[PDB]
Amino acid sequence: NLAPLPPHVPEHLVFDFDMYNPSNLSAGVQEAWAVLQESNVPDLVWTRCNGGHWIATRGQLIREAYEDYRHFSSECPFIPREAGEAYDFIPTSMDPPEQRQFRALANQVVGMPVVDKLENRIQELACSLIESLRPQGQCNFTEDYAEPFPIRIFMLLAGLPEEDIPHLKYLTDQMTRPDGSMTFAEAKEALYDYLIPIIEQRRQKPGTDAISIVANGQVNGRPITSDEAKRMCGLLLVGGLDIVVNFLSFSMEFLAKSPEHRQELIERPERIPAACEELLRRFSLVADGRILTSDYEFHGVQLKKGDQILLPQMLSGLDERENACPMHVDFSRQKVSHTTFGHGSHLCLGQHLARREIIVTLKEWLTRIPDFSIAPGAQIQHKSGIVSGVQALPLVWDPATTKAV
Numbered sequence: 001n002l003a004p005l006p007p008h009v010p011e012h013l014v015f016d017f018d019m020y021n022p023s024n025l026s027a028g029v030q031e032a033w034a035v036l037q038e039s040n041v042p043d044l045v046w047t048r049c050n051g052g053h054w055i056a057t058r059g060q061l062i063r064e065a066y067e068d069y070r071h072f073s074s075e076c077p078f079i080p081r082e083a084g085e086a087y088d089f090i091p092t093s094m095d096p097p098e099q100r101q102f103r104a105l106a107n108q109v110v111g112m113p114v115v116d117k118l119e120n121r122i123q124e125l126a127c128s129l130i131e132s133l134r135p136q137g138q139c140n141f142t143e144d145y146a147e148p149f150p151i152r153i154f155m156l157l158a159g160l161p162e163e164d165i166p167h168l169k170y171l172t173d174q175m176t177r178p179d180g181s182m183t184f185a186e187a188k189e190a191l192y193d194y195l196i197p198i199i200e201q202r203r204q205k206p207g208t209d210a211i212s213i214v215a216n217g218q219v220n221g222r223p224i225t226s227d228e229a230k231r232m233c234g235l236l237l238v239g240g241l242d243i244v245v246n247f248l249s250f251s252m253e254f255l256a257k258s259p260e261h262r263q264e265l266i267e268r269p270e271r272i273p274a275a276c277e278e279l280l281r282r283f284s285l286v287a288d289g290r291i292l293t294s295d296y297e298f299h300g301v302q303l304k305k306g307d308q309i310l311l312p313q314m315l316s317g318l319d320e321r322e323n324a325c326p327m328h329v330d331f332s333r334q335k336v337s338h339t340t341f342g343h344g345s346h347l348c349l350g351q352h353l354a355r356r357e358i359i360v361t362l363k364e365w366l367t368r369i370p371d372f373s374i375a376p377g378a379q380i381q382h383k384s385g386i387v388s389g390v391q392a393l394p395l396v397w398d399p400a401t402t403k404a405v
């Protein structure tokens with residue numbers, strides 16, 4: 001389904017890439033997206049898919065546009081437009097300066113200090129989950145660990161019942177990887193319907209959970225409104241329940257496939273933090289965009305007000321000009337360049353939490369289960385969207401080779 005080419009788009013800049021169902025998805029989602037970095041593809045293209053929009057394919061352009069909120073606004077960050085228009089999450093839907101006050105509050109609930117106090121619990125959860133799988137000699141990593149681990153830590157942070165996980169997991173998936181089961185606006189509304197009563201209570205009888213902190217916070221020297229709290233909590237939920245889960249699967253899929261890379265970390269664990277950075281670069285999984293606030297000539301290309309441009313955070317680190325042999329995983333890369341956590345004023349506020357969750361997983365897993373592989377005959381399926389993911393990851397190992405720690 002391709003939309004009619006607009007009057008201002010030169011035919012030679014057209015490249016019909018569908019971010020929700022790329023071509024060589026069989027080669028892996030990152031590989032599927034990297035086709036935009038081929039020699040026969042211009043730096044900036046227009047795709048007639050998903051309503052029609054631009055795509056910046058180079059790290060230089062992606063970074064540039066993310067710094068220029070004057071022309072590239074985040075008020076409409078999702079494609080298709082219907083989604084971007086319904087998008088009202090705080091603080092992402094706001095451009096500076098207004099966005100700044102909310103970023104501070106959000107940092108109070110997911111910032112480093114909060115993660116720090118949670119360290120022992122994150123560790124215990126990783127160790128507990130892994131140890132219970134170890135004897136089995138097999139597991140579907142996505143649902144046996146990738147999902148329960150990060151999701152349980154966040155439900156803990158936000159003080160929400162584990163009984164609500166299934167519902168929230170479903171809603172957040174609808175927002176990042178539309179199943180067609182419901183529109184973004186519809187999934188967002190359901191999410192807000194769930195959140196409103198909770199924010200009301202937390203405001204009356206406030207606990208110590210992140211929702212209670214956001215709900216009774218102060219911004220710009222005045223109290224945050226119920227509406228603002230709701231819009232901020234919704235983003236925190238989507239960010240905390242959907243991203244790390246999928247990133248862990250991409251990483252484990254690779255490690256299950258590369259024994260040499262597993263050994264490297266098993267022998268030199270001090271190299272894990274560095275390994276984390278390289279994996280975050282190689283298996284970057286986010287891609288959203290901005291909307292043109294006015295007609296603008298970007299690198300010789302005429303952009304029109306209202307035009308939407310996809311600025312894939314995932315593509316920057318895969319760009320050959322940013323990192324040599326971008327597709328090769330090298331834990332000793334001295335210069336790991338990437339925009340996996342964003343760029344500009346909207347830099348990810350949950351970086352510390354994500355890194356710790358990834359680092360703790362790698363360390364505790366390779367400690368008890370150093371040797372494992374993908375169940376033979378398994379075909380790992382990837383999914384593309386605002387946040388790309390892995391359907392399932394059937395793993396196997398010989399229990400005689402594991403160590404109870």
Ligand code: HEM
Nearest residue numbers: 091092236239240243244286313341342346348349350354
């Ligand atoms: C590996 C996991 C993660 C990745 C790759 C990631 C990536 C991103 C990216 C690329 C953005 C920028 C979006 C834009 O500029 O339009 C972002 C924003 C944000 N992320 Fe993360 N994120 C991750 C995990 C999390 C987690 C764990 C949370 C915590 C709940 C979170 C909370 C946020 C928030 C609140 C923002 C908004 C910041 C702002 O608009 O000023 N993220 N993230």
Ligand SMILES: CC1(C)[C@@H]2CC[C@@]1(C)C(=O)C2
Nearest residue numbers: 092176238239286288386
């Ligand atoms: C693009 C994102 C990854 C970022 C955090 C969650 C997300 C889906 C948003 O709506 C902002």
